[PDB]
Design an enzyme around this catalytic site. Structure first.
Site, mmCIF file in Angstrom:
data_model
loop_
_atom_site.group_PDB
_atom_site.id
_atom_site.type_symbol
_atom_site.label_atom_id
_atom_site.label_comp_id
_atom_site.label_asym_id
_atom_site.label_seq_id
_atom_site.Cartn_x
_atom_site.Cartn_y
_atom_site.Cartn_z
ATOM 1 C CE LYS A 54 -21.510 -7.746 -5.107
ATOM 2 N NZ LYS A 54 -22.282 -7.062 -4.060
ATOM 3 C CE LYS A 66 -11.898 -5.777 -13.961
ATOM 4 N NZ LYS A 66 -13.270 -6.121 -14.259
ATOM 5 C CB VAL A 97 3.674 15.523 -19.116
ATOM 6 C CG1 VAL A 97 3.905 16.830 -19.328
ATOM 7 C CG2 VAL A 97 4.676 14.426 -19.727
ATOM 8 N NE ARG A 177 -4.286 15.511 7.175
ATOM 9 C CZ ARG A 177 -4.332 15.413 5.908
ATOM 10 N NH1 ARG A 177 -4.848 16.574 5.082
ATOM 11 N NH2 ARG A 177 -3.786 14.405 5.149
ATOM 12 C CG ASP A 248 -1.160 25.011 -6.806
ATOM 13 O OD1 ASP A 248 -0.499 24.998 -7.717
ATOM 14 O OD2 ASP A 248 -2.009 24.178 -6.471
#
Length: 327
Positions: A54, A66, A97, A177, A248
């Site tokens: 934390k 958790k 997908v 990079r 892209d």
DNA sequence: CCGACTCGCATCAGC
DNA sequence: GCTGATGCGA
DNA sequence: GTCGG
């Protein structure tokens, strides 16, 4: 550090992130769990308690709880439960997908379509993107070794120059990079004729040429400034064929090109740091422009940028090559 | 306590 | 038919 | 879910 340290915790948190995003449709919880997973993944000690965790920024009360449960029992009741839930696990799976997001995956599972085999049988219910994502399901989950990225870049830069030697193309992302592997190829394109104050064929002719030499194999989406599709390296005519890859291609006005290259080179962390620093020097940097901030915070006109270094110079930073943009 | 945490393209919903 | 919203991915 | 104004 190595997974040996906190991999159990970070795998737990990533799995929880995925269910938030794909099943609960709670994108900010998805990003909260991812943020927690990343800060923990960088923590150079094996965590002994939720309380210890934390202290890290992005880990709050609930994830600390958790972590306590995971450290004590080796599992998390809620995740064990959702894992065996047929509906939730199927929705989560279907989003792997490309083109099937949380809304489509939920709709599919609602009508009994839960597996790749089910999708293969219901092609009429898939849009063009989703059909491509299904066709290349396994390929799209493979990483791309840097050597193949170099062969990929060879083709892109050659064909771009062949179309018009005045194009400027830059393969960005982690590849630029220096990364040993990539998830996809991100190409930034400009042309001296395309400015923010200016042809709606500049992108198309590059895509067409890459299609003509059979490098681009499929198109997910294509407009006047962004192409998102599929490509494949030619195979040795003898050897095994290469996986299909996501590529892209973005067309960016020349006066915004180097802001674009800077942004799409990243890191994300380096981008945030540079943007933080720009503010403190009186500038605002986004993906398009760098603009001065007046004393009351009003943005001025975009400043001329003709190199990445111009942006570093404006905010009085030492130019750092992409390999040193980890943070 | 309570809001924060970008955009191009494909396609849908509504007119 | 057109406009705007939504889903999606990155 | 976490942070913070």
């Amino acid at each position: 550090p190595q997974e040996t340290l906190n991999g159990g915790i970070t795998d737990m948190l990533t799995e929880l992130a995925n269910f938030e995003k794909n099943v609960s449709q709670a994108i900010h919880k998805y990003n909260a769990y991812r943020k927690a997973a990343s800060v923990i993944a960088k923590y150079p000690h094996k965590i002994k308690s939720g309380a210890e965790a934390k202290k890290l920024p992005g880990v709050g009360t609930k994830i600390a709880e958790k972590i306590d449960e995971f450290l004590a029992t080796g599992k998390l009741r809620k995740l064990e439960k959702i894992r065996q839930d047929d509906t939730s696990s199927s929705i989560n799976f279907l989003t792997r997908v490309s083109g099937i997001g949380p809304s489509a995956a939920r709709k599919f599972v609602d009508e009994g379509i839960k597996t790749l085999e089910d999708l293969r049988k219901n092609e009429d219910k898939l849009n063009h993107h989703q059909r491509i994502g299904l066709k290349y399901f396994g390929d799209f989950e493979k990483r791309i070794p840097r050597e193949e990225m170099l062969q990929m870049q060879d083709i892109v830069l050659n064909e771009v120059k062949k179309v018009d030697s005045e194009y400027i193309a830059t393969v960005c992302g982690s590849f630029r990079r220096g990364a040993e592997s990539s998830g996809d190829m991100d190409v930034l394109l400009t042309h001296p004729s395309f400015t923010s104050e200016s042809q709606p064929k500049l992108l198309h002719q590059v895509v067409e040429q890459l299609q003509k030499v059979h490098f681009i194999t499929d198109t997910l989406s294509k407009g006047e400034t962004k192409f998102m599709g599929v490509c494949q390296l030619p195979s040795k005519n003898d050897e095994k064929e290469y996986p299909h890859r996501r590529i892209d291609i973005r067309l960016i006005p020349k006066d915004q090109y180097y802001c674009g290259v800077l942004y799409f080179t990243g890191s994300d962390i380096f981008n945030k740091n540079m943007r933080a620093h720009a503010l403190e020097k009186g500038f605002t940097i986004n993906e398009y422009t760098i603009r001065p901030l007046g004393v009351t915070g009003v943005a001025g006109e975009p400043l001329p940028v003709d190199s990445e270094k111009d942006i570093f110079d404006y905010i009085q930073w030492k130019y750092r090559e992409p390999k040193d943009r980890s943070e």
